[PDB]
Amino acid sequence: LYFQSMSFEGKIALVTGASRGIGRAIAETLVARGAKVIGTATSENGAKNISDYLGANGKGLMLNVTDPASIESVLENIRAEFGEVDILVNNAGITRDNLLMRMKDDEWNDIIETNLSSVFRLSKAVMRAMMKKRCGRIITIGSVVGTMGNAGQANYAAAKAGLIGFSKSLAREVASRGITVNVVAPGFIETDMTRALSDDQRAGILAQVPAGRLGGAQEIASAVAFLASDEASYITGETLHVNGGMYMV
Amino acid sequence: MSFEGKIALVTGASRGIGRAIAETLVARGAKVIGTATSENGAKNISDYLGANGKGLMLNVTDPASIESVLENIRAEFGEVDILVNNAGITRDNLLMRMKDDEWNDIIETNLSSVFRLSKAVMRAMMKKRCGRIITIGSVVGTMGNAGQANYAAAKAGLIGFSKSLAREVASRGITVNVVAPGFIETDMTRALSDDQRAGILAQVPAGRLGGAQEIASAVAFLASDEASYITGETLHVNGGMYMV
Amino acid sequence: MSFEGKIALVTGASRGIGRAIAETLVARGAKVIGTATSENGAKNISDYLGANGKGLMLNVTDPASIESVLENIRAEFGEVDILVNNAGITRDNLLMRMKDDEWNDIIETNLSSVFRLSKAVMRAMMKKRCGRIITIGSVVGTMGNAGQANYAAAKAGLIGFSKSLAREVASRGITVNVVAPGFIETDMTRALSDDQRAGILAQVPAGRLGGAQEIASAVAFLASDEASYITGETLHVNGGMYMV
Amino acid sequence: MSFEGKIALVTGASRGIGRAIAETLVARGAKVIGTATSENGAKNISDYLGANGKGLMLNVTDPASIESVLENIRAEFGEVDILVNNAGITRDNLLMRMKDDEWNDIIETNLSSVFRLSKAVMRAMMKKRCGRIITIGSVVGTMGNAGQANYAAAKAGLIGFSKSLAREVASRGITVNVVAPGFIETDMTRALSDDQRAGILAQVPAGRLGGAQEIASAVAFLASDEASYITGETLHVNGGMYMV
């Protein structure tokens, strides 16, 4: 058919933090376009819920990214059940905001490990298969903070800017072999949180966003799905900013 | 389908990028007006667009010619939903050899045309509270290129334009973005020598030249309803030639 | 001092940044030729430069005046070692109300001026394998700003020009760089309501408006021998209003 | 534009960039504490600083060592007015061969160090409502480099960190900045193949490797009272290797 290349069938997609919000939006979108999605979560309850909504189109698994041992059996589980990972989506970002003078060492370490080093560990683990296949996608869910900096979020900003630098390097290494490594940088996105924010709080967030709204989880998903698709094979080492104009370039 | 009931103006749609954009939109359900400098240009456009659209003669540097094409489109189709600025030429030279008119032509055709055509479509977009303005820039504007300072000013300047404009119209559901292609295989690049081509390909980690559809796919995404939260942004499609 | 024996050409040197640049360069041992739009401006410019330089009337849009000015500089002083391009103007308006003329004037004065003046001083710089071209841009060209789509097209455009030019002449000991002021205190800003100056200060983490001298110090640094490994770069001096 | 009465702490001051930073501030009136990871390197720093400062041993990945140095410095000198983070190392490998600790050591030596040292001198700079933080980055953090993904992630992270700390302390008259060297001639550099050196020079329009003093000047300018309106900015010193 015309648009035959547009399908994701035959492709295996690994999405981290797929329990809610963006991550769930990504997994659902990829499945809707024909891919088998494996979503991962931090707890065993998180994994089961993911398996629930993926149903027959994929699998939930509990992956504790920080533990290198956790990665190995999760990838092996996928290889045995589905196969090698065609598409890696790194979406396991947390936040531990504080100003610098009040910032605890653990809050710095846990942000660096969960948001920055998680990317390196997972990218490495899926790297080799995509190089044999000569086709691959790595997309990391970044943040406008990494570009702009935000007071009280120096750890976040450091992690989110680091994964851009990490991606550009990886891109240069694997570009020649049909692998793509990009970042999607969201602005304020509406979540399970935000709905309980106060009118004053919600106003102050909106003042920052020229578009005058918060973005949708799906808006991030559709960026990710385009970049993970066969018509984005010429984009690597790039950051696709989805923030309603809160920042530019 | 995806652009059900949307009217798109693609300037410079005779070939390459422009033709690939027009057809991608038509293939996804838009009425498409594609533009050319010449009669046969416009005629041949209308030929390949057939029932899904129409080719018109447009001179992006002439205010009167803009006035007629848009007034022409309004009469028969309606108001423009999606504007793609893909006019743009080169006149390369080192600075020390660049003629004043080689500068001015590149400025008029590749930068000031972006101002004229966007202003002309925006009133209606502001009123409708929805829209898309998309401009085809170039890696050159971000990276700079010896022998192309006029191109680099124009392609850089269309980004600064887009940003400001994107701030003026963000609140009313209009996005304004730039797709910045790297080296895209064209007639002229197939005409290069073996040694020149090697020099091009050496700059591109991906190891190939890009295809026009690759730009077309990027533009259709940004013009779609799923790209609504992206404004004032530059989507680089250069195979790794340059990064961020 | 740092600039002994060097000849500097500072365009728009009547007041503000232009004057502060001219004064700093004199302080540090340079013979400076400042320009102004009027013969009266040149009067004042010569008045404050004294035996360290001279004022001249220069119309950056007119090739005829560009040549005349350069002949007189070569006659009375020698070959321009340092070109500082600071002949910017403003014509703010929203896109819907921007006149064709407000666009063109900004593009001519603020962008195309950098092309003509850089081109005119460049040959001598390459003959001596040493030189400095520094253009005064604006944060607006990087972040964009509603009502300043013409100014931002230009301020961004001159960065694309500088990146290309830098690549053409790096091999020959010349640097081409841009200094980007955020909000700088001028007589125009001093004249603003308390509400307006509050709104500006909210945008600037440093709590203040920058000073003309602060821009000059960045220019003086880039023009020095301590910046000879810096080319193609933008130096943002905006108290944190925008970052990178 | 002296640094009289100022106390500057340059981590990684044994040789090269850090020793030129250290020496240059001394020459402009600063008392300087230079650091190294071994007590011998700390000895050699004391020797060349002599009367104008002192060397000390600092393990930037250890909070204990950080406190020991800083309380020492408060004793003999006072509070740190100026902080230069020049304590990068590399641990190069393509991603498939990069081991966990090779990733971890570079993140902790080149990025978390910036966090730990910056917090460590921040409070005193906040009470005095004046300060300077400058981190030595790398063009690699901006453009990315194959086989350097850990180095680039860190060198980029420290720009993101610097941007938000700048926002936190800008209103109290402290700037936080990055200098991003390109290829800088070192002892390790002069000792490579002609083939290697030629391949480094291939990437630099300036035609040459940068010097350690050139980076020191950028740092010296940024730490001066003339750079008070620059914060959250990266200043790229790379011969045009990369642009903006």
PDB file of C-alpha atoms in Angstrom, chain B residues 72-220:
ATOM      1  CA  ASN B  72      -6.750  34.293  -6.140  1.00  0.00           C
ATOM      2  CA  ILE B  73      -6.634  31.449  -3.598  1.00  0.00           C
ATOM      3  CA  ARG B  74      -9.220  33.112  -1.338  1.00  0.00           C
ATOM      4  CA  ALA B  75     -11.773  33.415  -4.148  1.00  0.00           C
ATOM      5  CA  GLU B  76     -11.683  29.776  -5.271  1.00  0.00           C
ATOM      6  CA  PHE B  77     -10.477  27.702  -2.310  1.00  0.00           C
ATOM      7  CA  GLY B  78     -10.685  29.759   0.892  1.00  0.00           C
ATOM      8  CA  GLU B  79      -8.180  31.063   3.440  1.00  0.00           C
ATOM      9  CA  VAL B  80      -4.737  29.434   3.817  1.00  0.00           C
ATOM     10  CA  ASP B  81      -4.303  27.072   6.785  1.00  0.00           C
ATOM     11  CA  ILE B  82      -0.709  25.933   6.211  1.00  0.00           C
ATOM     12  CA  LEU B  83       2.019  28.106   4.669  1.00  0.00           C
ATOM     13  CA  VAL B  84       5.271  26.461   3.548  1.00  0.00           C
ATOM     14  CA  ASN B  85       8.012  28.926   2.532  1.00  0.00           C
ATOM     15  CA  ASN B  86      10.322  26.996   0.210  1.00  0.00           C
ATOM     16  CA  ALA B  87      11.370  29.741  -2.152  1.00  0.00           C
ATOM     17  CA  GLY B  88      15.098  30.207  -1.871  1.00  0.00           C
ATOM     18  CA  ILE B  89      18.091  30.229  -4.228  1.00  0.00           C
ATOM     19  CA  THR B  90      21.866  30.409  -3.941  1.00  0.00           C
ATOM     20  CA  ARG B  91      24.443  32.800  -5.396  1.00  0.00           C
ATOM     21  CA  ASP B  92      27.691  31.625  -3.795  1.00  0.00           C
ATOM     22  CA  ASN B  93      30.995  33.499  -3.639  1.00  0.00           C
ATOM     23  CA  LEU B  94      33.685  34.280  -1.120  1.00  0.00           C
ATOM     24  CA  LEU B  95      32.986  37.639   0.487  1.00  0.00           C
ATOM     25  CA  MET B  96      35.886  39.385  -1.241  1.00  0.00           C
ATOM     26  CA  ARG B  97      34.298  38.461  -4.616  1.00  0.00           C
ATOM     27  CA  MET B  98      30.576  38.641  -3.847  1.00  0.00           C
ATOM     28  CA  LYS B  99      28.713  41.233  -5.904  1.00  0.00           C
ATOM     29  CA  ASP B 100      26.221  43.542  -4.205  1.00  0.00           C
ATOM     30  CA  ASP B 101      23.363  42.040  -6.240  1.00  0.00           C
ATOM     31  CA  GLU B 102      24.389  38.511  -5.283  1.00  0.00           C
ATOM     32  CA  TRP B 103      23.864  39.673  -1.693  1.00  0.00           C
ATOM     33  CA  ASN B 104      20.604  41.528  -2.295  1.00  0.00           C
ATOM     34  CA  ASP B 105      19.035  38.728  -4.325  1.00  0.00           C
ATOM     35  CA  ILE B 106      19.709  36.143  -1.629  1.00  0.00           C
ATOM     36  CA  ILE B 107      18.359  38.522   1.002  1.00  0.00           C
ATOM     37  CA  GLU B 108      15.190  39.291  -0.964  1.00  0.00           C
ATOM     38  CA  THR B 109      14.431  35.785  -2.162  1.00  0.00           C
ATOM     39  CA  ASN B 110      15.383  33.806   0.965  1.00  0.00           C
ATOM     40  CA  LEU B 111      14.698  36.198   3.866  1.00  0.00           C
ATOM     41  CA  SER B 112      12.365  39.090   2.976  1.00  0.00           C
ATOM     42  CA  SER B 113      10.112  36.677   1.082  1.00  0.00           C
ATOM     43  CA  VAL B 114       9.505  34.918   4.410  1.00  0.00           C
ATOM     44  CA  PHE B 115       8.270  38.190   5.887  1.00  0.00           C
ATOM     45  CA  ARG B 116       5.981  39.081   2.997  1.00  0.00           C
ATOM     46  CA  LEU B 117       4.320  35.710   2.566  1.00  0.00           C
ATOM     47  CA  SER B 118       3.767  35.172   6.290  1.00  0.00           C
ATOM     48  CA  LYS B 119       2.255  38.612   6.907  1.00  0.00           C
ATOM     49  CA  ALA B 120      -0.064  38.011   3.951  1.00  0.00           C
ATOM     50  CA  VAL B 121      -1.484  34.769   5.400  1.00  0.00           C
ATOM     51  CA  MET B 122      -1.616  35.617   9.081  1.00  0.00           C
ATOM     52  CA  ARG B 123      -4.649  37.874   9.420  1.00  0.00           C
ATOM     53  CA  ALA B 124      -6.852  34.933   8.458  1.00  0.00           C
ATOM     54  CA  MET B 125      -4.869  32.618  10.745  1.00  0.00           C
ATOM     55  CA  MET B 126      -5.264  34.970  13.699  1.00  0.00           C
ATOM     56  CA  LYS B 127      -9.018  35.136  13.051  1.00  0.00           C
ATOM     57  CA  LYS B 128      -9.415  31.357  12.733  1.00  0.00           C
ATOM     58  CA  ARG B 129      -7.287  30.795  15.897  1.00  0.00           C
ATOM     59  CA  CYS B 130      -5.437  27.937  14.169  1.00  0.00           C
ATOM     60  CA  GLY B 131      -2.611  27.775  11.656  1.00  0.00           C
ATOM     61  CA  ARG B 132       0.809  26.628  10.491  1.00  0.00           C
ATOM     62  CA  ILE B 133       3.718  28.624   9.076  1.00  0.00           C
ATOM     63  CA  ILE B 134       6.712  26.491   8.133  1.00  0.00           C
ATOM     64  CA  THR B 135       9.921  27.697   6.522  1.00  0.00           C
ATOM     65  CA  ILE B 136      12.631  25.614   4.853  1.00  0.00           C
ATOM     66  CA  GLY B 137      15.916  26.919   6.261  1.00  0.00           C
ATOM     67  CA  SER B 138      19.321  25.283   5.973  1.00  0.00           C
ATOM     68  CA  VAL B 139      22.028  23.856   8.221  1.00  0.00           C
ATOM     69  CA  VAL B 140      24.095  26.699   6.736  1.00  0.00           C
ATOM     70  CA  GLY B 141      22.222  29.281   8.815  1.00  0.00           C
ATOM     71  CA  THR B 142      23.206  27.500  12.034  1.00  0.00           C
ATOM     72  CA  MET B 143      26.733  26.410  11.069  1.00  0.00           C
ATOM     73  CA  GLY B 144      27.907  29.053   8.555  1.00  0.00           C
ATOM     74  CA  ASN B 145      29.605  28.149   5.290  1.00  0.00           C
ATOM     75  CA  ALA B 146      32.544  29.692   3.467  1.00  0.00           C
ATOM     76  CA  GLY B 147      31.397  31.033   0.127  1.00  0.00           C
ATOM     77  CA  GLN B 148      27.790  31.328   1.368  1.00  0.00           C
ATOM     78  CA  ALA B 149      27.636  34.286   3.735  1.00  0.00           C
ATOM     79  CA  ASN B 150      24.591  35.681   1.917  1.00  0.00           C
ATOM     80  CA  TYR B 151      22.765  32.357   2.188  1.00  0.00           C
ATOM     81  CA  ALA B 152      23.838  32.018   5.815  1.00  0.00           C
ATOM     82  CA  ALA B 153      22.503  35.456   6.738  1.00  0.00           C
ATOM     83  CA  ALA B 154      19.170  34.748   5.069  1.00  0.00           C
ATOM     84  CA  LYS B 155      18.700  31.269   6.514  1.00  0.00           C
ATOM     85  CA  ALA B 156      19.779  32.489   9.951  1.00  0.00           C
ATOM     86  CA  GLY B 157      17.517  35.519   9.706  1.00  0.00           C
ATOM     87  CA  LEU B 158      14.426  33.507   8.878  1.00  0.00           C
ATOM     88  CA  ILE B 159      14.885  31.797  12.255  1.00  0.00           C
ATOM     89  CA  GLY B 160      14.970  35.090  14.146  1.00  0.00           C
ATOM     90  CA  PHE B 161      11.918  36.159  12.170  1.00  0.00           C
ATOM     91  CA  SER B 162      10.095  32.896  12.913  1.00  0.00           C
ATOM     92  CA  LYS B 163      10.803  33.160  16.630  1.00  0.00           C
ATOM     93  CA  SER B 164       9.404  36.689  17.096  1.00  0.00           C
ATOM     94  CA  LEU B 165       6.438  35.867  14.872  1.00  0.00           C
ATOM     95  CA  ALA B 166       5.898  32.658  16.838  1.00  0.00           C
ATOM     96  CA  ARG B 167       5.663  34.785  19.998  1.00  0.00           C
ATOM     97  CA  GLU B 168       3.113  37.138  18.416  1.00  0.00           C
ATOM     98  CA  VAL B 169       0.744  34.343  17.403  1.00  0.00           C
ATOM     99  CA  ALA B 170       1.371  31.480  19.843  1.00  0.00           C
ATOM    100  CA  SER B 171      -1.596  32.341  22.056  1.00  0.00           C
ATOM    101  CA  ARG B 172      -4.020  31.868  19.126  1.00  0.00           C
ATOM    102  CA  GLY B 173      -3.233  28.281  18.133  1.00  0.00           C
ATOM    103  CA  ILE B 174      -0.734  29.078  15.341  1.00  0.00           C
ATOM    104  CA  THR B 175       2.744  27.556  15.254  1.00  0.00           C
ATOM    105  CA  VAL B 176       5.719  28.971  13.317  1.00  0.00           C
ATOM    106  CA  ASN B 177       8.677  26.623  12.782  1.00  0.00           C
ATOM    107  CA  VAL B 178      11.703  25.984  10.584  1.00  0.00           C
ATOM    108  CA  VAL B 179      12.869  22.734   9.020  1.00  0.00           C
ATOM    109  CA  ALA B 180      16.624  23.041   8.465  1.00  0.00           C
ATOM    110  CA  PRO B 181      17.879  20.485   5.948  1.00  0.00           C
ATOM    111  CA  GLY B 182      21.464  19.412   5.582  1.00  0.00           C
ATOM    112  CA  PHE B 183      22.845  18.184   2.248  1.00  0.00           C
ATOM    113  CA  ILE B 184      19.860  16.991   0.188  1.00  0.00           C
ATOM    114  CA  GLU B 185      20.459  15.161  -3.098  1.00  0.00           C
ATOM    115  CA  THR B 186      19.393  17.425  -5.978  1.00  0.00           C
ATOM    116  CA  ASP B 187      20.203  17.916  -9.634  1.00  0.00           C
ATOM    117  CA  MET B 188      23.291  19.974  -8.797  1.00  0.00           C
ATOM    118  CA  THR B 189      24.715  17.463  -6.304  1.00  0.00           C
ATOM    119  CA  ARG B 190      24.393  14.634  -8.828  1.00  0.00           C
ATOM    120  CA  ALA B 191      26.427  16.974 -11.054  1.00  0.00           C
ATOM    121  CA  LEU B 192      29.306  17.343  -8.736  1.00  0.00           C
ATOM    122  CA  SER B 193      32.603  15.766  -9.377  1.00  0.00           C
ATOM    123  CA  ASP B 194      33.820  12.719  -7.612  1.00  0.00           C
ATOM    124  CA  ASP B 195      36.140  14.764  -5.426  1.00  0.00           C
ATOM    125  CA  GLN B 196      33.565  17.339  -4.465  1.00  0.00           C
ATOM    126  CA  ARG B 197      31.066  14.705  -3.485  1.00  0.00           C
ATOM    127  CA  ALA B 198      33.537  12.955  -1.315  1.00  0.00           C
ATOM    128  CA  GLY B 199      34.019  16.271   0.462  1.00  0.00           C
ATOM    129  CA  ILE B 200      30.277  16.605   1.029  1.00  0.00           C
ATOM    130  CA  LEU B 201      29.764  13.049   2.255  1.00  0.00           C
ATOM    131  CA  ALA B 202      32.710  13.390   4.607  1.00  0.00           C
ATOM    132  CA  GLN B 203      30.812  16.038   6.576  1.00  0.00           C
ATOM    133  CA  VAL B 204      27.794  13.776   7.148  1.00  0.00           C
ATOM    134  CA  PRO B 205      28.072  11.061   9.817  1.00  0.00           C
ATOM    135  CA  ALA B 206      25.064   9.250   8.303  1.00  0.00           C
ATOM    136  CA  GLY B 207      27.168   8.612   5.168  1.00  0.00           C
ATOM    137  CA  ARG B 208      24.474   9.443   2.597  1.00  0.00           C
ATOM    138  CA  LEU B 209      22.836  12.508   1.156  1.00  0.00           C
ATOM    139  CA  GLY B 210      19.322  13.185   2.326  1.00  0.00           C
ATOM    140  CA  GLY B 211      16.287  12.648   0.142  1.00  0.00           C
ATOM    141  CA  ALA B 212      13.633  15.261  -0.527  1.00  0.00           C
ATOM    142  CA  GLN B 213      10.936  13.119   1.093  1.00  0.00           C
ATOM    143  CA  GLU B 214      12.932  13.252   4.337  1.00  0.00           C
ATOM    144  CA  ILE B 215      12.311  17.003   4.398  1.00  0.00           C
ATOM    145  CA  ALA B 216       8.759  16.441   3.190  1.00  0.00           C
ATOM    146  CA  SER B 217       8.067  14.053   6.087  1.00  0.00           C
ATOM    147  CA  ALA B 218       9.415  16.552   8.626  1.00  0.00           C
ATOM    148  CA  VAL B 219       7.239  19.344   7.167  1.00  0.00           C
ATOM    149  CA  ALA B 220       4.047  17.270   7.165  1.00  0.00           C
TER     150      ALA B 220
END
